[PDB]
């Protein structure tokens, strides 16, 4: 079950060590923004930041305050608001970062907060011991998504690529390369069949059902933009 905190964050436990939070933000639309604590010896790594600086603080202080954790890393699914809308402060805070080297370059075009280090493939990050595997498996709702995979506890942030169970839309396609979006959620299926909990970008947390759940969405989208 969720704790509720300040700036309209809730967060929820999912093992000892990995907990997920849901940050709502103000849109044009109160909208629900995903991302995960993952917490090794004191240390947190946060997977997303919430769209701005302010609910980053909270949410940071709260690892502090709560779980005893200092956040020293961090990784965006891809250059959206709801991935890296708060890293001008985790920058402040002196918080190392890591992030697909598309995202890197997507981020400096755009004049948005820069992440220090990029990968192209695969990247695992070891969080005092504790590994954390990034992989960029092709474009999909951004060119740049990638995934975050938590070995030790099989748990996989698809990040904003997967849609929750009760999602019904294919939503935000300005970043998206369509085509290739079953594709890259046909190889995080084929390389992720160990999964307890899956968790996307937005709305409720499931489990490998939301990757084959997300490719019907995708391809009735390809299939209703196709006709005459
Ligand atoms: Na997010
Ligand atoms: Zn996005
Ligand atoms: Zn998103």
Redesign the pocket.
């Given at each position: 079950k969720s704790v509720k905190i300040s700036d309209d964050i809730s967060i929820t436990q999912l093992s000892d060590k990995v907990y997920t939070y849901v940050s709502l933000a103000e849109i044009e639309g109160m909208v629900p923004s995903n991302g995960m604590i993952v917490i090794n010896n004191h240390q947190a790594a946060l997977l997303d930041t919430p769209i701005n600086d302010a609910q980053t603080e909270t949410l940071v202080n709260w690892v502090a305050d709560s779980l005893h954790a200092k956040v020293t890393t961090f990784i965006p699914?891809?250059?959206?608001?709801?991935?890296i809308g708060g890293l001008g402060y985790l920058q402040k805070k002196g918080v190392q970062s890591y992030a697909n080297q598309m995202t890197i370059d997507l981020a400096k075009e755009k004049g948005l907060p820069v992440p220090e280090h990029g990968f192209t493939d695969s990247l695992t990050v070891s969080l005092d011991g504790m590994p954390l595997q990034c992989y960029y498996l092709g474009g999909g709702?951004?060119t740049d998504?990638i995934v975050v995979w938590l070995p030790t506890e099989n748990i996989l942030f698809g990040?904003?690529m997967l849609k929750d169970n009760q999602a019904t839309s294919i939503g935000?396609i300005s970043?998206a390369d369509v085509t290739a979006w079953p594709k890259t959620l046909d190889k995080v299926k084929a390389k992720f069949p160990s999964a307890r909990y899956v968790v996307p970008?937005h709305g409720d947390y499931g489990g490998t059902e939301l990757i084959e759940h997300t490719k019907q969405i995708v391809n009735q989208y390809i299939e209703s933009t196709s006709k005459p």
């Open positions: 699914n891809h250059w959206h608001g709801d991935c709702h951004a998504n990040g904003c935000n970043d970008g």
